[PDB]
Design a protein around this nucleic acid. Sequence first.
RNA 1: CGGAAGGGAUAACCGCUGAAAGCAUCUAAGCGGGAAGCCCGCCCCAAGAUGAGGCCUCCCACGGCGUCAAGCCGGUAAGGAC
RNA 2: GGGGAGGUUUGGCACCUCGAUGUCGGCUCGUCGCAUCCUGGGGCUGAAGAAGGUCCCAAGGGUUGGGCUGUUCGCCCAUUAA
RNA 3: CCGAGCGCGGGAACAACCGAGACCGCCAGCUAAGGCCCCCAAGUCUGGGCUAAGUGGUAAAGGAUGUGGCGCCGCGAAGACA
Lengths: 138, 167, 205, 37
Amino acid sequence: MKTYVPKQVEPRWVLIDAEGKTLGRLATKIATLLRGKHRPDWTPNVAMGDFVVVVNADKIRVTGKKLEQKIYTRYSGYPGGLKKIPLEKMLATHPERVLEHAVKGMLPKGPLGRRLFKRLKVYAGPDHPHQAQRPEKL
Amino acid sequence: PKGVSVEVAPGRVKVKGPKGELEVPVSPEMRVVVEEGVVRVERPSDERRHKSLHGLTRTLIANAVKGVSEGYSKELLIKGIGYRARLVGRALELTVGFSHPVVVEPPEGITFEVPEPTRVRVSGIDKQKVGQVAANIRAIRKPSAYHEKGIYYAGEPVRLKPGKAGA
Amino acid sequence: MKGILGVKVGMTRIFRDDRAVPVTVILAGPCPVVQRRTPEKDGYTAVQLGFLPQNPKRVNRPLKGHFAKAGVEPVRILREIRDFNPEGDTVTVEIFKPGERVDVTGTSKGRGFAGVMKRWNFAGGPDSHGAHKIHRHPGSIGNRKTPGRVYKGKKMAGHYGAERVTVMNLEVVDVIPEENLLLVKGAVPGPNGGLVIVRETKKAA
Amino acid sequence: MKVRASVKRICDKCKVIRRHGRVYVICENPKHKQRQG
RNA sequence: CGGAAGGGAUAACCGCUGAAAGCAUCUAAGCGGGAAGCCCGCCCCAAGAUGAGGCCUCCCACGGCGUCAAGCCGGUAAGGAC
RNA sequence: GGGGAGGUUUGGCACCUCGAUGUCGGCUCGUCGCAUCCUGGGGCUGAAGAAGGUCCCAAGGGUUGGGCUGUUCGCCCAUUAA
RNA sequence: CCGAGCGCGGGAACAACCGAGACCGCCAGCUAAGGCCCCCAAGUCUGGGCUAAGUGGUAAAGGAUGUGGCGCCGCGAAGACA
């Protein structure tokens, strides 16, 4: 025969917690969902993996000293442009990042790996734009 | 712990006394309850962290009770020469080795009070934040300075030779 | 952190006090306030500020003759003071009093594409001994093989002119309501008869 | 002494207190103010 | 005229209540002081911040092929340009 | 007398390059490093004060101008918080 | 072993470390080395031990009341550590 090709599938939204979950353990799952890898109809080259909006990120938990320890680096092309912000302050200002980040490096990278990150919309809250389905999960 | 006023909560023993009430939040790990007329405390097991926390907390809250039962006896004995302690209105205006008068202000939770300029009295109704400000005055003017002069609690000064040992 | 809009004029030295003072004047004049701003539907706290009346047909359309109060448009249109809520009416000049220090913002005139000496400032060199081929030139830029890249932002041969700067800590000694002028310790940036906003200084608050 | 790799109890009236992360050796006369460093 | 003032977390270090280990401790729970250093305040860029954001106004259909599907074609209205 | 770290010096090796990798100092232009020379702070001192010594943290900013020598290194010079 | 196996898969990338001899096709099954949380294919399997350092994520003589576990010789209900 010849293995099957899902036609234009509908984009199923979801929603996951945040608060209480361990930062990394979360994405691990979350990731998989952004791609079709949970779906019994996954396909590499199409991105039909679930739009994961997330609620109250600001209360993400994580282990050890990572609160203080963990360092979020950023380097402009300008010599000496290396700016390293800690997980700590990173919670305090725009905490949503920390998730989106832990995440954004659990995808692959070719032009769609980033298309998929657009398929993700966390907030520190809860709240979101109640657009549709978004059936809660666990 | 007689006419006290304890109050167990998840992990915070709010205690009222004849003076005021304090809140002393410690880890729920072990066992916090009032029983029979006196408060108790007990570890979950024979474990490093557990053991330590058990002792720590037991005497923490133990003092907490005694604090609102009046545990104040801390006051500084300013030894020197031209070091005078005054108290005008709300502010203690002592004048020590510094070229200017030291402006101290009795804050929220404790009450100072200067008997005579030779020595400042502190009524402290909060065993924690008490030694803090004791140390505050004693570190506003460090004593013993080679021979003498400064701010002592009462601790005997270790000496050190005067106009000598400057080879 | 109040403010005012203004045009530039003068620079002199008025022998006030006893000594002398380089004095730059500005006309704040009838400079409108034509639209406030509020957090939820903005995010800050601000006011738009107009200027000099001569506007007939060449302007038209939205005007903000709408807005809520018309007042027509100047011709030098309007800008924005941040963190400022006025009393309402077209503010003038006497916003500040003779005895205050302030900050002043304006474009730097155009010196365009310039030589690195007259820019950030370099050196060039050898008028004689060495050669003639590198009088007004940068000489070096970066390291041999590693980097092998030319440092991003390495002070280079380029533009230096039509820009903009805010100056801090000046001293407005005079202010005439009768003709709408404001006289400061001469330091004004930009040419005479141009665009410049005055706002209060900063120091310890 | 005072800051060094090797840090003893030297005079009996000293104690080794693993404080703020690293080993110290404190006493009365801070001339033996040792420290693992 | 600019380096400020000041705020927030810190090093080395100095301290407070306090155990395991009746006594001790600046700590393993908690808390305070503390640097030209770190974050900011300050000046400037900057929504090509593909995520193009926000505010204030201003103009408005069927006109010929797409009936249902996104276009396509000729001048217009705010306008903008040569 | 032991143990290390560093990769500047001085050497051992001869793997890229012999159809080329133009070697010194100075000009110009730097940037990084910290085992800090100056400036904060702090510790201890055989530290009265003064100034000094030594050890830890700290690169933000600074690190001058003339004489001799091609000379970097050096000495001198008049200085500087350096 | 390469060279001649820069044909294959691990080894992050790497002629020679590990595994393993390519006549060709296959949208078929096992399995090696490594590996199974997601790269990237498969156990966030099973069960119990150690550690609090990001050790793991590459350094010594040496140093310390770090923490788990083992052993030895007194002290002690005649009464002790403090």
